[PDB]
Symmetry: C2
Subunit: 328 residues, 2 copies
């Protein structure tokens, strides 16, 4: 009932049915407590991911206003850009991608394999830049150039993280609540926290549907101090758009992303190897590997509010495995 103003926003159907919520018996056995996983990595469009939930709302908005071109930005190995380009192809929309190399790698698989390979298959127009120092401004400059060609552009921010995009994860929280109902008494939820839309959406949804559940964001690019205001801003904007209040404190752990965004670390790699070998589940070196390392250490250090079941949100990212191999 409380999230009913969600039905107001037009949305396209890219996912279909609720994604699986699975128990992880072998990981749970190893970690010494109940771990469940929300399989948002399993969606039907071009290798899946959390970004698709946001695109359901963003692209419906684009269509509503008569846009014929989607413009967005990210790393060369961005999952969002790949999912945006896939959706654009599907719908016969043009797509323009402003890409940066965030880690200064010259490794050929990072440069041309994985997500970047898929972009070419989707006929994405590629605009390279030195760095995304001011993505919102840089995207508008690009959109102006594109508009001059007679295209009707729709700008999608980095990671699809606007209040509207984040509605996708308010929706995901509904699924989670219904899937857990009479099945599992959840204590904590863990999600990677990057451009912040996923975290913020879940934060609003879970505050209203499962208020006693502790939502933990594991940062992938920023410290708590830098990240927290971004998550809060979105949380409040989302709540406002839904005619709701959001009084919950945002929780973030920033210990698991060093030496920085898009750079693999040992604990991340070990988390990837653990999920693959114990559960046959594929994580990624940029996002989910790092988020899972956070979950594991949180259990190790008793960081969670209590000992109860933890739900891991699998936000996707596996195609990056092929870009990061063998190194850099």
């Amino acid at each position: 009932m409380p999230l009913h103003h969600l039905t107001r926003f037009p949305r396209l159907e890219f996912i279909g049915a609720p994604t699986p919520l699975e128990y992880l018996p072998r990981l749970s056995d190893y970690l010494g407590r109940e771990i469940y996983i929300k399989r948002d990595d399993v969606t039907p469009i071009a290798m899946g991911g959390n970004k698709l939930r946001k695109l359901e709302f963003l692209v419906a908005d684009a269509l509503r206003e008569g846009a014929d071109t989607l413009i967005t930005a990210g790393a060369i190995q961005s999952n969002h850009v790949r999912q945006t380009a896939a959706v654009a192809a599907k719908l016969g929309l043009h797509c323009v991608a402003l890409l940066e190399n965030p880690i200064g790698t010259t490794a050929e698989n990072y440069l041309t394999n994985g997500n970047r390979l898929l972009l070419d298959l989707f006929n994405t127009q590629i605009e390279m830049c030195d760095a995304l120092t001011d993505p919102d401004a840089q995207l508008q400059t690009l959109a102006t150039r594109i508009e001059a060609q007679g295209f009707r552009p729709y700008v999608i921010p980095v990671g699809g993280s606007s209040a509207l995009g984040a509605m996708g994860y308010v929706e995901s929280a509904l699924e989670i609540a219904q899937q857990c109902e009479e099945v599992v008494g959840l204590s904590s939820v863990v999600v990677a926290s990057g451009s912040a839309g996923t975290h913020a959406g879940l934060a609003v949804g879970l505050e209203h549907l499962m208020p006693d559940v502790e939502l933990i964001g594991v940062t992938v690019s920023r410290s708590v101090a830098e990240q927290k205001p971004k998550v809060i801003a979105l949380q409040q904007a989302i709540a406002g758009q839904l005619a709701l209040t959001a009084t919950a404190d945002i929780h973030l752990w920033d210990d698991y992303f060093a030496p920085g965004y898009g750079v693999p670390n040992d604990a991340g790699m070990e988390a990837v190897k653990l999920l693959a070998s114990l559960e046959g589940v594929l994580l990624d070196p940029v996002y989910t590997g790092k988020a899972m390392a956070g979950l594991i250490d949180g259990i190790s250090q008793k960081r969670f509010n209590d000992d109860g079941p933890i739900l891991f949100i699998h936000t996707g990212g596996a195609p990056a495995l092929f870009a990061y191999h063998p190194h850099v």
Copy 2:
């Protein structure tokens, strides 16, 4: 139900809900033909694919025999080996893979990226062989060796293609029949180790007898492939207490110069589906099968001009192994 004997087989749930069956409006508009797609590339385990449907029955059997190890075989970039290894990891079973390099490549991505990379993640024990000249025999030798080493192995044949494995594609046919009540003249599928083709053959005979099932070969001529598909067709039907009289249809014009080697038509089919529908095919299987489908249109090769259903059997992780070239 005429297919009642299917529930008599022990099966693990690896997939759950039926996979999507989708209309492809943009491809359809471009080809001037109604095209639908069975999304068996969207299965929840380790980047998905058709092999998982087979493994539901094969691995259930493995556990019934009390096995602790799964042993199978394929190319370095085998989708089947990758899905078997993921399933073994999930269930806490050892996995031993007998791998060959079918194309003589030394390309790094073929040798170490894509499906092969995932094998390492799943802690697969890898055994390289010069050639899978007699896979069934070579797998048995390995199994006896492993059993002598103090394990309880279960052998899964190449591509998971046994009568039991092929039950997974009788199951897919039931989904197709259910989902097509809103729609069909033809079905197109890649025909390799033959379990998918044969399973669909038996299912579709009983569920949608007016539909023409076309197998596009990915490794063999019609002469070499037809007896393999018929034999499995007959074995499946026998075990389900059914008769299978339907002819097997095969097109072999679309796989040159051989298994696991991309060709231009195949890669162009990949580009077409990606750019028109946001759908990812693969260089080894689905790209070639789709190339066949498209040529079937332009050569008026189907029995009539009506809607076509393409079976997406998966394979997309191989894109990353075949890039930039082999």
